[PDB]
Amino acid sequence: MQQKLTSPDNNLVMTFQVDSKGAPTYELTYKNKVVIKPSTLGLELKKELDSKTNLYDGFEVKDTQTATFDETWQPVWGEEKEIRNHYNELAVTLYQPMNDRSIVIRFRLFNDGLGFRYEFPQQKSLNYFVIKEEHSQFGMNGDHIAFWIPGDYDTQEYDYTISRLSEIRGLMKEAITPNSSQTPFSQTGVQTALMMKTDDGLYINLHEAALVDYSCMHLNLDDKNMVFESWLTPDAKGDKGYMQTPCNTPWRTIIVSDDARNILASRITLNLNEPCKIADAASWVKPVKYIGVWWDMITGKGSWAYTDELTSVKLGETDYSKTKPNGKHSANTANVKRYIDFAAAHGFDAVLVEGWNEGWEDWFGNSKDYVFDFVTPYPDFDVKEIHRYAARKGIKMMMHHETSASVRNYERHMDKAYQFMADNGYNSVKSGYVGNIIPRGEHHYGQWMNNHYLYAVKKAADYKIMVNAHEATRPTGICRTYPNLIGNESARGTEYESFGGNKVYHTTILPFTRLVGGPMDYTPGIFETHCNKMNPANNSQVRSTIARQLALYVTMYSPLQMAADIPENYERFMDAFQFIKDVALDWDETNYLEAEPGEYITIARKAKDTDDWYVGCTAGENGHTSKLVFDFLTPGKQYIATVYADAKDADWKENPQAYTIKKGILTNKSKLNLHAANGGGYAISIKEVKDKSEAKGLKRL
Amino acid sequence: MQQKLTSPDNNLVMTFQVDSKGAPTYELTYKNKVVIKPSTLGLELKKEDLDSKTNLYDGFEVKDTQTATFDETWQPVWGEEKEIRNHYNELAVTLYQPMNDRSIVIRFRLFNDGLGFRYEFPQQKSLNYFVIKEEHSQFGMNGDHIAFWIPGDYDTQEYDYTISRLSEIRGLMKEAITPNSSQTPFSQTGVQTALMMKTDDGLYINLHEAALVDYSCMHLNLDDKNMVFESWLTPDAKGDKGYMQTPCNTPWRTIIVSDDARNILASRITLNLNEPCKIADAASWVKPVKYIGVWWDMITGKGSWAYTDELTSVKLGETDYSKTKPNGKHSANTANVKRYIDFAAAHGFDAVLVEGWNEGWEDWFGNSKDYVFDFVTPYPDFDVKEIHRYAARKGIKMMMHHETSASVRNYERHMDKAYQFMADNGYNSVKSGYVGNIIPRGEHHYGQWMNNHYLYAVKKAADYKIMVNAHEATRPTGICRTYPNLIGNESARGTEYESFGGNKVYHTTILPFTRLVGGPMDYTPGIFETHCNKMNPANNSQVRSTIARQLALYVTMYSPLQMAADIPENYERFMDAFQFIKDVALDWDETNYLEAEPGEYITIARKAKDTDDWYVGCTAGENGHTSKLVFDFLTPGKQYIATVYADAKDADWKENPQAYTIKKGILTNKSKLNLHAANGGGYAISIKEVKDKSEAKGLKRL
Numbered sequence A: 001m002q003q004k005l006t007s008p009d010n011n012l013v014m015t016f017q018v019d020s021k022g023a024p025t026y027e028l029t030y031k032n033k034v035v036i037k038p039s040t041l042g043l044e045l046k047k048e049l050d051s052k053t054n055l056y057d058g059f060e061v062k063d064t065q066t067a068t069f070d071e072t073w074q075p076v077w078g079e080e081k082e083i084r085n086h087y088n089e090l091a092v093t094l095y096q097p098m099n100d101r102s103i104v105i106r107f108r109l110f111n112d113g114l115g116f117r118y119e120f121p122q123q124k125s126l127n128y129f130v131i132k133e134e135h136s137q138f139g140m141n142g143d144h145i146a147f148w149i150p151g152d153y154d155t156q157e158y159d160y161t162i163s164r165l166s167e168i169r170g171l172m173k174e175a176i177t178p179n180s181s182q183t184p185f186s187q188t189g190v191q192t193a194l195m196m197k198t199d200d201g202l203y204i205n206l207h208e209a210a211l212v213d214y215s216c217m218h219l220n221l222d223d224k225n226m227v228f229e230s231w232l233t234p235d236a237k238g239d240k241g242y243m244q245t246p247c248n249t250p251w252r253t254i255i256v257s258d259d260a261r262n263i264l265a266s267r268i269t270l271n272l273n274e275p276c277k278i279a280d281a282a283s284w285v286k287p288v289k290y291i292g293v294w295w296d297m298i299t300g301k302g303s304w305a306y307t308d309e310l311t312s313v314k315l316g317e318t319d320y321s322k323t324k325p326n327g328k329h330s331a332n333t334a335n336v337k338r339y340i341d342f343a344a345a346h347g348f349d350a351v352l353v354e355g356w357n358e359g360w361e362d363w364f365g366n367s368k369d370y371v372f373d374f375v376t377p378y379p380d381f382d383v384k385e386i387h388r389y390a391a392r393k394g395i396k397m398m399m400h401h402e403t404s405a406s407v408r409n410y411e412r413h414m415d416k417a418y419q420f421m422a423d424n425g426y427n428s429v430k431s432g433y434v435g436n437i438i439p440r441g442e443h444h445y446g447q448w449m450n451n452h453y454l455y456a457v458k459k460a461a462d463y464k465i466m467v468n469a470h471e472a473t474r475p476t477g478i479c480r481t482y483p484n485l486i487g488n489e490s491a492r493g494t495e496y497e498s499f500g501g502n503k504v505y506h507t508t509i510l511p512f513t514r515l516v517g518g519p520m521d522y523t524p525g526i527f528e529t530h531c532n533k534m535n536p537a538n539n540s541q542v543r544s545t546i547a548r549q550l551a552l553y554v555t556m557y558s559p560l561q562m563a564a565d566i567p568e569n570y571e572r573f574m575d576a577f578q579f580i581k582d583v584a585l586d587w588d589e590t591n592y593l594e595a596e597p598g599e600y601i602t603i604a605r606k607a608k609d610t611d612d613w614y615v616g617c618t619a620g621e622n623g624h625t626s627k628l629v630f631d632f633l634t635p636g637k638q639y640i641a642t643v644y645a646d647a648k649d650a651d652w653k654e655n656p657q658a659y660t661i662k663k664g665i666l667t668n669k670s671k672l673n674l675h676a677a678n679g680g681g682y683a684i685s686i687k688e689v690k691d692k693s694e695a696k697g698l699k700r701l
Numbered sequence B: 001m002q003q004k005l006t007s008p009d010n011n012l013v014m015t016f017q018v019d020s021k022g023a024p025t026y027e028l029t030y031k032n033k034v035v036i037k038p039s040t041l042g043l044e045l046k047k048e049d050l051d052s053k054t055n056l057y058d059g060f061e062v063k064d065t066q067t068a069t070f071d072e073t074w075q076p077v078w079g080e081e082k083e084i085r086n087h088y089n090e091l092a093v094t095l096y097q098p099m100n101d102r103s104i105v106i107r108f109r110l111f112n113d114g115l116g117f118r119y120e121f122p123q124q125k126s127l128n129y130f131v132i133k134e135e136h137s138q139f140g141m142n143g144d145h146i147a148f149w150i151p152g153d154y155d156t157q158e159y160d161y162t163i164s165r166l167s168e169i170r171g172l173m174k175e176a177i178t179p180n181s182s183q184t185p186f187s188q189t190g191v192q193t194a195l196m197m198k199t200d201d202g203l204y205i206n207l208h209e210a211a212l213v214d215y216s217c218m219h220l221n222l223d224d225k226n227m228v229f230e231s232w233l234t235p236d237a238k239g240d241k242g243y244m245q246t247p248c249n250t251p252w253r254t255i256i257v258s259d260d261a262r263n264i265l266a267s268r269i270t271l272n273l274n275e276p277c278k279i280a281d282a283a284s285w286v287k288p289v290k291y292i293g294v295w296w297d298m299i300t301g302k303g304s305w306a307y308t309d310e311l312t313s314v315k316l317g318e319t320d321y322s323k324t325k326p327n328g329k330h331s332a333n334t335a336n337v338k339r340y341i342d343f344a345a346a347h348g349f350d351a352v353l354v355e356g357w358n359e360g361w362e363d364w365f366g367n368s369k370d371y372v373f374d375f376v377t378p379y380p381d382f383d384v385k386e387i388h389r390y391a392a393r394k395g396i397k398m399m400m401h402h403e404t405s406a407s408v409r410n411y412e413r414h415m416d417k418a419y420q421f422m423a424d425n426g427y428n429s430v431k432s433g434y435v436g437n438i439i440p441r442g443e444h445h446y447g448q449w450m451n452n453h454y455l456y457a458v459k460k461a462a463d464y465k466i467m468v469n470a471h472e473a474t475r476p477t478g479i480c481r482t483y484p485n486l487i488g489n490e491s492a493r494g495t496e497y498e499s500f501g502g503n504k505v506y507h508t509t510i511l512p513f514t515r516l517v518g519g520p521m522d523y524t525p526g527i528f529e530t531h532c533n534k535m536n537p538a539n540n541s542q543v544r545s546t547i548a549r550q551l552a553l554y555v556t557m558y559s560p561l562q563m564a565a566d567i568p569e570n571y572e573r574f575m576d577a578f579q580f581i582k583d584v585a586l587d588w589d590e591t592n593y594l595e596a597e598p599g600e601y602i603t604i605a606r607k608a609k610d611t612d613d614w615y616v617g618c619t620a621g622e623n624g625h626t627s628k629l630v631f632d633f634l635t636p637g638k639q640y641i642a643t644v645y646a647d648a649k650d651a652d653w654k655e656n657p658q659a660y661t662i663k664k665g666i667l668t669n670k671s672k673l674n675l676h677a678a679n680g681g682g683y684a685i686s687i688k689e690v691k692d693k694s695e696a697k698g699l700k701r702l
């Protein structure tokens, strides 16, 4: 009666069966341990009691088809050169007599997890339909420890909370901190990817993959029975999805292992996404290391606005040439050139500039429709001169498209905006959606906006433009299909280190949650952790030591890496800055050395097309002691290794700038004991010795 | 204390003042008769995320007043006359609200035929960004007048009119609200504008608005106890009624009044209150259009918009129409279109409209489908290039059709490519449509959001030198003066409904007093075969009109855009009557409203622009109408060849609609004629100045 699906290695077993009332039910075990207790699958549809609204029970198995897939592919950019997609599949065709319609639930079981989705075939009795609620259950076998953030339709910029599932309800109120756009939905609602640690030694990750033509999935916890259930984002009318057969829901994933490191190594999310749709991607999509006129405005030292004498702005009417400069506008030609010089002097690829265009005076919280035109520069920003100058220095300018959440306005100006970028040498753009969405009533993660974010990415691909979108729906592996989407923030980033700070263990969690599905533009690299040095009125302190900031270039994976501090501060710590300069952006191999969510993450990566390795470790409040074994290096080879570590007396709060830099030789026989301070870590560059002269005067570490 | 404003002719007097609580209050009299009793003006604002800030309705002090007189004449690109005089006395009142330390301005403009007022919000510290919860502009009536109205609705204006006392509206609302794919009535006593009324003391009052831009559409809600109509704006998806940013103004609110119904039609207050033409070269490309089209086929059900019927649904870019089976009813096919092109060219028409030419029609209705059309990919049987080549050689222009199925983001995303496609393939005019509930879902057809879209579409079209006729859009308020390329809108119950059960017999005797105020309507008149079952056996709908009345509509339903809606085959059966449609002009140098009584009859004579030719039309209600015409408006000493197309004896819209007579003779400014319009009938007359005695040969005086 029931169907059994097993992973290639036999460790995981997914059992499927329709219960007595016709409800599709599944369960999952790992090494004979229950991971998912009997859980039902189905959806309730909006009424056009009407039986047609029922798409959750009264089903009977019409057909079952199995299959095995085992193919390897190569991402345009990633944590490794090649990814293996190996799974056993079970597709179940379910017929519903009362409605004379069928659906298919496809299961794909890998050695590290399970993925499933619903498929709605074109048929006489199922064409256009609206989803009221998706009812995908995830029954937990116990009151696990979770690493979560409040379920919210508009923001994911919350600090994580570590607690038992039974404790979420009582911590929700405090976990929900202020934000310009936020719509929490439940006292027990959380976002995905959700990370958990069980008492019987398992690590479980609940998430989704290929979120396309559908609303974002959050999870709502029944904290009495410990059952998580899909909770989609509603549109302006409360509906959760306009569908038209043939169509499918995104995949829902359960990644599990008794070794936390395997959670990080899993590629289930990417494997479940459609293959690359950009035929010539390889010729133009590429990693980017950059700096930018940014931290100035984030800390309050400088401003995005050109003037402070206007009550409001009317684009096309307000004549900025007649306004008085506020003396704080960082986005001015001379200043930009200084950044370009620094960028070129240290091997950076691009320079981001925010506040270059008209309109910033009204960018925040006004729910303004015609807020930006994305093409008209302020009087002090010479677009052409900056382009000529940047090109002369071998630098590329990164365009900035803050939309202030006015989406129709952005779409109306998009083609002209992208054409302006093309005409002026910008091949990458950082977009933003700060504020409540316009059309008013919609949320940042509903089906409507998900369509927009992808629309912006697909159009960008046509212009050979790469995109990094802040405030957009968190990633679900779509980068595989559209590799020009080199980033998103979509989580609490370094900017909040300027707004009071991020929890000390923040970066020891992000890799297990946010990063699953795509890279994050975290903008690490702050050396002067006291923001009051940028702006006297800003008393925020970055919760990190300098060594840990260096580590993030390896522990916070991304093909897009920013060195966020200002040039002046890097010039003060030029020796430590060398690691940021040296670190690669793309990798042929990645080895997860140590990993425990909320405590520590140590990773070693092999720079693409080289035999150079880079290591980074980020630790929580208890610090961490590592016993590194460099057996991943090549036998018979020697490497010039530079170790950037916390000083014995380092502390994120009391002594964040105390670090040591040691240079020596390493081989696959080398071993090192390193200690990461409280809120600290370390970084190591390991370069293969090409010429004997390189090792000249160096000894083993 | 009171402020007094008088019309240039002294017949109207507007009195303004703030009451004891500081509430702006105005009133209006006409020839010493109360038109507007003391009525309050103001707005309530949405609370921000000091409480008193939500108050923008009282606590005002008159801080300053400024008067002025304006008297200038201007010429519309197209219209009912060559020149329009804009003459008014103005009173601008600056109102200061101490509690919020902010001021607003209410500007009043009084014409000899009505009053117009609007609120102005200057840029200031305490008034920058604000959201309107409700506008509270009152219009206090002096009695239980008779009104010609349609249900207040955020999504449709395609209702038949109702004639009743104000006190009878509440009880008639339920039946007045008939079925429609997208409708959102808001009150048991809510009505739309322009609202027309007739008073017991001989006055005719019209309540409306002008220059609806960057604001939500205004409807009226009746307090039937005190007989006070009050502005009721269209809410957005979350219930709000207007996102404002100073400096900004509300549209104008108008009260047109006279003791002669004809003056209501003659009033140009609406156009006069709109901003001057913003299209500098308009005269070089904006032009009237008389057309026919592959349309009535689908409307009656004889033909279809869809190419095939074998698919349960379609997906653009995936569905391969070249592999589907033709349903055999697709009227938008090359061969058929060429037949229309031949007819149009043969009879002097300017363009041919074709609907159902593009992929996607299989799913066009009520699916709330986002990616419903791409506006550029033709069906397998519609050869865009060959149809263009043929039309051009024949001197005919193809009129593009852009039905959006109310999927607005989709239309905006495809708009530039769509307009460029038009430019690349010889189309310079487009008929757009918005059938179905709006997408973004939650918005209404007339909210501030869609009003922005409709104008965005028109402004962009102007850049491509394209003219627009938008169906289902917010009813016009004179914006055509600013953007002359907006040559039309339906935005009211049109001829298509004569195929869906019919329109009330008196419908066209009301539209000119209501819908037409603010802009022309693409009513698509000209149905000669009034029995729809002749088109489609299963359609028993009958057009409520005689053939003669249909001809009259080309004069009584003003528009620079005129369609001859019936199929060529039917016009060929009545080619003698068809002559009037062929002869009638589209633009006029002069217009004389001969007879006019809302709901009963309308008789108008117009002088074709740049000619000495006149055209007359009369449309009547269920009681018919006998006219005693006096042609003293014709030039003295001139002879005219007149052709009278009238209802034959015993003609009747229901029992004998095709009974008509045609008489030809000579007319002079001394001629007098008595004509009778039958029940649901009327008449049409072409009056051409004799240019050669040979034209009079054989003709006598009528």
Ligand SMILES: O=C(O)CN(CCN(CC(=O)O)CC(=O)O)CC(=O)O
Pocket: A451, A455, A458, A459, B317, B371
């Ligand atoms: O979105 C799809 O499903 C398929 N088509 C549909 C048209 N797109 C417009 C576009 O991609 O520019 C509609 C949309 O993205 O919503 C486009 C594509 O992605 O290749």
Ligand SMILES: O=C(O)CN(CCN(CC(=O)O)CC(=O)O)CC(=O)O
Pocket: A316, A370, B452, B455, B456, B459, B460
């Ligand atoms: O709409 C305005 O107020 C002024 N600008 C503003 C930009 N427009 C975009 C456009 O017209 O293409 C915004 C809008 O129409 O909402 C345009 C115009 O000349 O009307």
Ligand code: NA
Pocket: A157, A470, A471, A489, A493, A495
């Ligand atoms: Na952010």
Ligand code: NA
Pocket: B158, B471, B472, B490, B496
């Ligand atoms: Na219509």
